[PDB]
Design a protein around this ligand. Structure first.
Ligand SMILES: O=c1ccn([C@H]2C[C@H](O)[C@@H](COP(=O)(O)O)O2)c(=O)[nH]1
Ligand SMILES: O=c1ccn([C@H]2C[C@H](O)[C@@H](COP(=O)(O)O)O2)c(=O)[nH]1
Ligand SMILES: [Cl-]
Lengths: 287, 287
């Protein structure tokens, strides 16, 4: 029975061989395929890639920051995870014509869309309690009451809010699915940087699934990752060919250390990755 | 190259062989698989299924009806297509608690979200011009000016609006992609009745791509159909095994009969399906 990591490595291989050359907004150049889908089993394994070290601290801390609805890069910055920092900087905000906005204000990105979809965004300090739709809690209650439901969706693509956003979300929607007591999740990702983004993104949605599984009493099933524009940046080709030579190692397991009742209650300390000794990190220049 | 239709038929097969029983509200039951993807080439052919007849005129009228932003079932019904009629009727509306709604008023469904995303829904009679995001035109404008864009999305899944819709959308979002003068489109369909609904859905989005390609000077590229809950109703199993007997006849072609430059300008008479040779319609009862 093949290693789950092979779905991912297979996709890189496919894009390297069949991707078509396609310029991008950043100017870097890509090899590009439109429309891909892979399936990672969450059953007694957590698919944290092993052919390079993935930023597990970043994934967990960033997901908790989404859960709490934060739209303040500094709030994540402070937990030791700098991934959003450039996007909240003075210069960049200015780049986009957001001169009035205070630094760190990312606008109505994921955390606001997850907890407050449709509320009038003001700034990153505002109290949004009980405004907009709480999609994350709705997904959880739907699972608890009607697992057969075919509309368990959370959606961060808000055409109305895109003008106000630092970055338009790559992870546009996700759907949950339950049969035989197993919770699955399919993410629609409109845009995937295969090198730097995608491994992080898989870990991030798998983690969401385990969290949701845990508070609804279900076992984690499958994470189905669907891609729009799946791309390898031209300058990721060499780092990736090195990656492609390494041997997958067993995926870690993910242990949740205490029974947790509300998704809001999860703390970073609740979670232990166990058995993860990946091949070394591989830097890939950000585009 | 294998017939495109085989993608669909092989999905039916997979669900028959591999799907798991899952209940729905009707008490029909389904076999179900979560997460599937098929690719239909649009180059010089049009995937209107041939192993049963597809309701092409329903497809074309319905798509033109969405493009106008209509949410009134009666406007479609006057074209000879009755697919939305039940959902707009006095008894149905009452069943949803829209006791005071004019009959035909579907609430903010596809047409409204496509043309007026995020406007406050009034009724099916209202003038909406100027309000909401005209996602369909924005997608068009973006294809002409910035074909490389990885953000060309139209979203019908509006959590704010769901409580007011006759039905929640099955097609939650679609993404467009351009490379080498070819326009592709991926649909994310959260829920697919494989027998009754999917061959229709496929024709629908293939048609839309053909329309947009036309007005932007592009060749049709690929249609990628992604599915969440891909299901066969138990009372379709037998009809489907009849269908699987049949061997696909070359897909017809779509000719568009005149130069049209605004998507609103398309009329049904503008389109000819040429060389469609389906086996007979197979009746499949609505769940
Ligand atoms: O979680 C994320 C965020 C971004 N990206 C990549 C995809 C693109 O390369 C780029 C976003 O830029 P656009 O697709 O918007 O051009 O970052 C990811 O892979 N994952
Ligand atoms: O364009 C459409 C609309 C509906 N359905 C099917 C999918 C489900 O069987 C049902 C919708 O019911 P829910 O998924 O909302 O329960 O209709 C389609 O296949 N295509
Ligand atoms: Cl990483």
């Amino acid at each position: 029975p093949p290693h789950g990591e092979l779905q991912y490595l297979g996709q890189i291989q496919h894009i390297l061989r069949c991707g078509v050359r396609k310029d991008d907004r950043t100017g870097t150049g890509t090899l590009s395929v439109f429309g891909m889908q892979a399936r990672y089993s969450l059953r007694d394994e957590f698919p944290l890639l092993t052919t390079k070290r993935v930023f597990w601290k970043g994934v967990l801390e960033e997901l908790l920051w989404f859960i709490k609805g934060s739209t303040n890069a500094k709030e994540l910055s402070s937990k030791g995870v700098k991934i959003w920092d450039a996007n909240g900087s003075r210069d960049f905000l200015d780049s986009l014509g957001f001169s009035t906005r205070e630094e760190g204000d990312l606008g109505p990105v994921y955390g606001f869309q997850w907890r407050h979809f449709g509320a009038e965004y003001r700034d990153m300090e505002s109290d949004y309690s009980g405004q907009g739709v709480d999609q994350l809690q709705r997904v959880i209650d739907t699972i608890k009451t009607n697992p057969d439901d075919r509309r368990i969706i959370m959606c961060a693509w808000n055409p109305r809010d895109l003008p106000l956003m630092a970055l338009p979300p790559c992870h546009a929607l996700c759907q949950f699915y339950v049969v035989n007591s197993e919770l699955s999740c399919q993410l629609y990702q409109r845009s995937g940087d295969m090198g730097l983004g995608v491994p992080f993104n898989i870990a991030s949605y798998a983690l969401l699934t385990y969290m949701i599984a845990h508070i609804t009493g279900l076992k984690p099933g499958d994470f189905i990752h669907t891609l729009g524009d799946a791309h390898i940046y031209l300058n990721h080709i060499e780092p990736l060919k090195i990656q492609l030579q390494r041997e997958p190692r067993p995926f870690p397991k993910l242990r949740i250390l205490r029974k947790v009742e509300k998704i809001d209650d999860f703390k970073a300390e609740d979670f232990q990755i166990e058995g993860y000794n990946p091949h070394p990190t591989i830097k890939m220049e950000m585009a």
